Amino acid sequence: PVGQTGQLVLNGAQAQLDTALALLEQVDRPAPVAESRTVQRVFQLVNASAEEVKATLEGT
Amino acid sequence: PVGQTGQLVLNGAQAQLDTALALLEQVDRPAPVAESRTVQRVFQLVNAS
């Protein structure tokens, strides 16, 4: 390895070399991403009052 | 194993290979899901307050 830089100097016969590169082409893909721990939604109220709805939902 | 990526490079004779793949087709299914620890119900009262 070239340090911790995501590079990798690999050094062998050409038969091994063109076999390992075909495997690595298959079993090597970027990691998945986390989704999020927080989301937002916005509701445009039509009949109710947004401040009374908030007080109702909070028990105040 | 290819790290912890849910992949598995398995490498043997073809007889063993077509037998292990038939078993794994049987005893390998996705895990079940938890239900939830919280539920909501809404009641529209008619007579009471």
Partner: peptide, 29 residues
């Protein structure tokens, strides 16, 4: 704990929020 209860005066709605066992108790009341 105990189930959370939310009362809306405008719509006369009762909202119970808790574990499935705590919610079935209010549902039968």
């Amino acid at each position: 704990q105990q189930a959370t209860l939310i009362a809306d005066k405008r719509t006369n709605s009762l909202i119970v929020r808790g574990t499935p066992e705590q919610v079935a108790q209010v549902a039968e009341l």
